[PDB]
From a paper:
Arrest peptides containing RAPP (ArgAlaProPro) motifs have been discovered in both Gram-positive and Gram-negative bacteria, where they are thought to regulate expression of important protein localization machinery components. The ApdA, ApdP and ApcA arrest peptides stall the ribosome with a peptidyl-RAP-tRNA located in the P-site and a Pro-tRNA (for ApdA and ApdP) or Gly-tRNA (for ApcA) in the A-site16. The PTC of the ribosome is in an induced state with a fully accommodated Pro-tRNA, thus, the stage is set for peptide bond formation to occur, yet, the nucleophilic attack does not take place. Our structures and MD simulations indicate that the nucleophilic attack cannot occur because the nitrogen of the Pro in the A-site forms a hydrogen bond with the carbonyl-oxygen of the Ala of the RAP motif in the P-site.
The ApdA-SRC was applied to cryo-grids and analyzed using single-particle cryo-EM. Focused 3D classification revealed two major subpopulations of 70S ribosomes, one bearing A- and P-site tRNAs (43%; 142,978 particles) and one with only P-site tRNA (46%; 152,257 particles), collectively representing a total of 89% of the initial ribosomal particles. The 70S ribosome with A- and P-site tRNAs was further refined, yielding a cryo-EM map of the ApdA-stalled-ribosomal complex (ApdA-SRC) with an average resolution of 2.3 Å. In the ApdA-SRC, the ApdA nascent polypeptide chain (NC) was well-resolved near the PTC, such that nine amino acids, including sidechains, could be modeled unambiguously, covering the C-terminal conserved 120RAP122 motif that is directly linked to the CCA-end of the P-site tRNA. In addition, the high quality of the cryo-EM map density allowed the Pro123 moiety attached to the CCA-end of the A-site tRNA to be unambiguously identified and modeled. In contrast to the RAPP motif, the conformation of the modeled residues located N-terminally is distinct when comparing ApdA and ApdP, which is not unexpected given the lack of sequence homology in this region. The three N-terminal residues (Lys128-Ile130) observed for ApdP form a network of direct and water-mediated interactions with A2062 and U2506 of the 23 S rRNA. Similar interactions are observed for the corresponding region of ApdA (Leu117-Asp119) with direct and water-mediated interactions observed to A2091 and G2534 (EcU2505). Unlike for ApdP, we observe an additional three residues (Arg114–Ala116) of ApdA that establish direct and water-mediated interactions with U793 (EcΨ746), C1811 (EcU1782), C2615 (EcU2586), U2638 (EcU2609), and A2087/A2088 (EcA2058/A2059). A comparison of the 23S rRNA nucleotides that surround and interact with these five ApdA residues (115LALGD 119) in the ApdA-SRC with the equivalent 23S rRNA nucleotides in the E. coli ribosome revealed no discernable conformational differences that would provide an explanation for the species-specific stalling.
Author numbering:
A (entry chain T): 2 to 90
B (entry chain 2): 1 to 44
C (entry chain C): 2 to 274
The structure:
Amino acid sequence: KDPRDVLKRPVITERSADLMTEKKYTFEVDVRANKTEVKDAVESIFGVKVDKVNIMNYKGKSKRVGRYTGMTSRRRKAIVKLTADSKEI
Amino acid sequence: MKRTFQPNNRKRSKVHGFRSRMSSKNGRLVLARRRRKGRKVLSA
Amino acid sequence: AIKKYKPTSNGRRGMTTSDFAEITTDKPEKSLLAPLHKKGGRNNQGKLTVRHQGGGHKRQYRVIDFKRDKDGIPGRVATVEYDPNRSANIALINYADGEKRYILAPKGIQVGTEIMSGPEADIKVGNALPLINIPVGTVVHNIELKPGKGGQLVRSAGTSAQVLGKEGKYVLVRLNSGEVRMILSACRASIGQVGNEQHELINIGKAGRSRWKGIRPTVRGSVMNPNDHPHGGGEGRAPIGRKSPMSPWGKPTLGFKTRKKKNKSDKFIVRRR
RNA sequence: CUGAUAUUGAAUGUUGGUAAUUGACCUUCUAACCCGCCGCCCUUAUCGGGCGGGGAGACAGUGUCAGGUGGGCAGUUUG
RNA sequence: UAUGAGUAGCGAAAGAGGGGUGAGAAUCCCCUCCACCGAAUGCCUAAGGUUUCCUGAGGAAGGCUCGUCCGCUCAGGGUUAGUCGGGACCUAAGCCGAGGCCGAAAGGCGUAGGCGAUGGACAACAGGUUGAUAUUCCUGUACCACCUCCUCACCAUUUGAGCAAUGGGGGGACGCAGGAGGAUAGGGUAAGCGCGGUAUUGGAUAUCCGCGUCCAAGCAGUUAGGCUGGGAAAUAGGCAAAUCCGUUUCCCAAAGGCUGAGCUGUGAUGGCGAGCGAGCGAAGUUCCUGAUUCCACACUGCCAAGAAAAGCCUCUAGCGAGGUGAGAGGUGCCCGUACCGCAAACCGACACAGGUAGGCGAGGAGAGAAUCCUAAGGUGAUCGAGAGAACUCUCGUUAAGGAACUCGGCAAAAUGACCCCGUAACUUCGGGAGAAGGGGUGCUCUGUUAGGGUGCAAGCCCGAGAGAGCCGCAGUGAAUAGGCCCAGGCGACUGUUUAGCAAAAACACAGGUCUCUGCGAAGCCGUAAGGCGAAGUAUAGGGGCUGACGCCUGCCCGG
RNA sequence: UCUACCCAUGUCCAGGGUGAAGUUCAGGUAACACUGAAUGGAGGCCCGAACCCACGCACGUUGAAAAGUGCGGGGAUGAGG
Ligand SMILES: [K+]
Ligand SMILES: [K+]
Ligand SMILES: [K+]
Ligand SMILES: [K+]
Ligand SMILES: [K+]
Ligand SMILES: [K+]
Ligand SMILES: [K+]
Ligand SMILES: [K+]
Ligand SMILES: [K+]
Ligand SMILES: [K+]
Ligand SMILES: [Mg+2]
Ligand SMILES: [Mg+2]
Ligand SMILES: [Mg+2]
Ligand SMILES: [Mg+2]
Ligand SMILES: [Mg+2]
Ligand SMILES: [Mg+2]
Ligand SMILES: [Mg+2]
Ligand SMILES: [Mg+2]
Ligand SMILES: [Mg+2]
Ligand SMILES: [Mg+2]
Ligand SMILES: [Mg+2]
Ligand SMILES: [Mg+2]
Ligand SMILES: [Mg+2]
Ligand SMILES: [Mg+2]
Ligand SMILES: [Mg+2]
Ligand SMILES: [Mg+2]
Ligand SMILES: [Mg+2]
Ligand SMILES: [Mg+2]
Ligand SMILES: [Mg+2]
Ligand SMILES: [Mg+2]
Ligand SMILES: [Mg+2]
Ligand SMILES: [Mg+2]
Ligand SMILES: [Mg+2]
Ligand SMILES: [Mg+2]
Ligand SMILES: [Mg+2]
Ligand SMILES: [Mg+2]
Ligand SMILES: [Mg+2]
Ligand SMILES: [Mg+2]
Ligand SMILES: [Mg+2]
Ligand SMILES: [Mg+2]
Ligand SMILES: [Mg+2]
Ligand SMILES: [Mg+2]
Ligand SMILES: [Mg+2]
Ligand SMILES: [Mg+2]
Ligand SMILES: [Mg+2]
Ligand SMILES: [Mg+2]
Ligand SMILES: [Mg+2]
Ligand SMILES: [Mg+2]
Ligand SMILES: [Mg+2]
Ligand SMILES: [Mg+2]
Ligand SMILES: [Mg+2]
Ligand SMILES: [Mg+2]
Ligand SMILES: [Mg+2]
Ligand SMILES: [Mg+2]
């Protein structure tokens, strides 16, 4: 599989922005991607050194638009901590 | 007072779930009937 | 001996127990234990097929040597132990070659006694021989019906059978019941009365003690309703009110003989009880 | 529960029609059938099967037919 | 869509005022005092729910009123793990079940083998931090498994180190009760120490007042202690083999090991810490008390005789030319993680007086988790304002009388704690019995009594029984806490039962008796296979009747 | 998933009392019996919270609740929850 299949998009929030001060980058990842695959993919794509990857699953949020109930997608969020001697993403 | 429905997801699945239904002829007729009626939910 | 408790409560009044004088250890041989779950009188369908069975104390099975097939190797009685699975006590035998087995404890037997199986053994309490080798009038127990199958008859506390005569292939044996019966002369028996002879005198004393032994209450038929039992119903108390007393399944239950007519073993039964 | 008959064979006397032929009965045999007995093997298996012993044995079990019993259960009647 | 009707109701509970916000305020926010829970109405956490969590905005509907608010609407946001719980580990009941057995069909049963926690096994702790997660992030300090580009030491290349089973053995491995220890958590703040304060209501620099008064896993050491006796030789057994286990013989007798709460040191030149004001930061000891926890089912006793399997250890069978140990470097996946969880978020159609397993559960007085008042902490309850009629409900009191009431003392009243005295018939000799009936009970001084615990002492803690006084209507001054007796029927007894109109004299029961059952038992379930009975075997099992115990249990076999 | 019974595996039960067998010592006898004291800690034992139950009354009866609440009540180491 391609590394760029693994990382989907960056998470841009206040929390994510605060973690970037600590050299921690938050990505949404493929819901099938284990944290080793994420580590490998971040090093491959961005040419950085990864200290650790923490990873969590979000359920879909129930949603309404008028008379139609449904569900947002499940998400897998990875917080990637780079090593202290490393280039920034 | 203890009422009759005491929820428990394991027991729900084991008694009424898809694999329970599939494990007997009569459970497979339930699924056929519910597909025939066009139910959105075939099983617990 | 039987220990009578003092009437310190209504529960305890009349209650008696074994003193367990014969028992020499409190700990069974771990290598001869096997697991034993209760069944509640329920069969493979999960249905109750025997009434009044349920609960009671958890028990481990002690694997008894009913076959007595270590011929010629002497064994020393190491213990006499409580067995929860049967009325008799059991004896751990240390065989000379390092094998350990349990046997039914005969009346008399002592720690240190040597026992021996096989056709060239003495007629001593605790030995086991083919019935062709046992003299007439010998009191025996743990009698086989099929060569090699193991002892089936006369195993309960205090029971005994006497060898009456020899008819070549068969030996006559008076069983505990008093039935005289032909047994194949190749079938083994063990010498002596089974021990724990006082077992029958125990007064259980209270309802709860029956419950500890896995007995659930018996409800009489005559206090059931007609849909439950032939004796059910009637306004107020009623007599049996039927030609015969009846079982719950509508057979006569007082005098009606239930041994199968055309039983194959009828030829071997000389005198019925 | 009981009989007949099939599965079901081999001998031995015995006693009914028929002086030499057929039924009934008793006993014995083993080879069918049975084994909730033992050893071995398939096999890491208290299932099953095979093989060898042992027990039992033409009985039992089972099929068909028959009589008895049978509120255990069923359908009903009880102007 | 009416009527009933502006009626019944608005679902247990303490608020008051000041300030604010706003179109609008009893109801939202803040402040102050007051009040309620406190073996919970607190903290944690199941199951279940599934975003209800946080922030900002909103007010149509939902909310029994209102609403600026909200578990509601709309936007955004929020759940971080080698070590926690689950999986990549183990098995129980049970379930599935290759072949197989049985059966009109469908199927039923069942072996090997699996699945299956509610159990077994198993490596991380303290502190800090966000609006919203935290043994998960951060800091500090660890541990476990595995790997080898490397380093060092050691051993050995076929009488050859080492590894070693999917096999053997050991172990894991187990009940209930009781009491003694040892310890710790927790508690008291007793002493000491530290910081702050000296009052304006008469008094107090005082035996004055308030607040605080420590700390992990890990590593090293030690320990109350608890378990086991130990060596050598020989071996009809442990499916094969064992140098292991079992057995025996001989020798020796306190050694050995195996565990062990906790403690000491280190961890910590750190952290926390009254308070001062994100920072900064004092003292941080001793004494007393003390578990329902731990050592630990350890011990003792008892009968009703108390899972399995793996991890683990060991043994050989094997494998085997490279191994073993210690560093150093490195690797470590998935699932859950928000929030509610005695509740307005779960089960009850409701923001419903009901139900909901488990862990922790402070102080005073107390035997106590009772009780009353409080702590930590939580809460003031989603309609209000008046008025203070009948009547109804829940409470309090009541002259004289005291069951006259009534089917019936129903209801209520009375009794009630501790210590002491004393206690009948009858009895199965246990009981009856808290029988009954009486007495004492506060406070002060003697007095830090005698005496006891702890300690080297100082001290702290427990503490009779006396004597002398003092006060009240009343001293277990509140809350909580048996009414008792005489005689009879029924059932011996503790139990059980008509969920939701019957708790009983009914059922059960221990005991009695009859009867069936010789083991492929009888009986029972099933068409059968297969089962229960029972891994039982006549001192056992099934069925009927009777129902502790005592004395007894007559006559009739014609039906 | 309520409920009846059963099976496997967990767990809960503040406190207080009474004082069975046994044991020890003393006495006691030719031996035993037997007696006393201490010890000991039995029990479907006792009192009593949690918990479980549901006896009486009142209230409720278009309920706060399609079985409850209040005040009393019973069991509370067991045939227990
Ligand atoms: K009794
Ligand atoms: K009965
Ligand atoms: K009747
Ligand atoms: K309370
Ligand atoms: K708002
Ligand atoms: K884990
Ligand atoms: K640890
Ligand atoms: K330490
Ligand atoms: K969390
Ligand atoms: K009844
Ligand atoms: Mg995670
Ligand atoms: Mg019975
Ligand atoms: Mg009836
Ligand atoms: Mg009938
Ligand atoms: Mg009748
Ligand atoms: Mg009558
Ligand atoms: Mg009929
Ligand atoms: Mg009809
Ligand atoms: Mg009006
Ligand atoms: Mg009005
Ligand atoms: Mg009106
Ligand atoms: Mg009115
Ligand atoms: Mg009104
Ligand atoms: Mg209200
Ligand atoms: Mg909120
Ligand atoms: Mg409104
Ligand atoms: Mg785990
Ligand atoms: Mg099956
Ligand atoms: Mg098949
Ligand atoms: Mg579990
Ligand atoms: Mg762990
Ligand atoms: Mg939170
Ligand atoms: Mg949380
Ligand atoms: Mg509620
Ligand atoms: Mg409960
Ligand atoms: Mg308290
Ligand atoms: Mg009056
Ligand atoms: Mg008066
Ligand atoms: Mg009157
Ligand atoms: Mg009158
Ligand atoms: Mg009354
Ligand atoms: Mg009664
Ligand atoms: Mg009762
Ligand atoms: Mg009722
Ligand atoms: Mg009930
Ligand atoms: Mg009632
Ligand atoms: Mg059968
Ligand atoms: Mg069986
Ligand atoms: Mg009766
Ligand atoms: Mg009677
Ligand atoms: Mg009579
Ligand atoms: Mg009791
Ligand atoms: Mg009680
Ligand atoms: Mg009550």
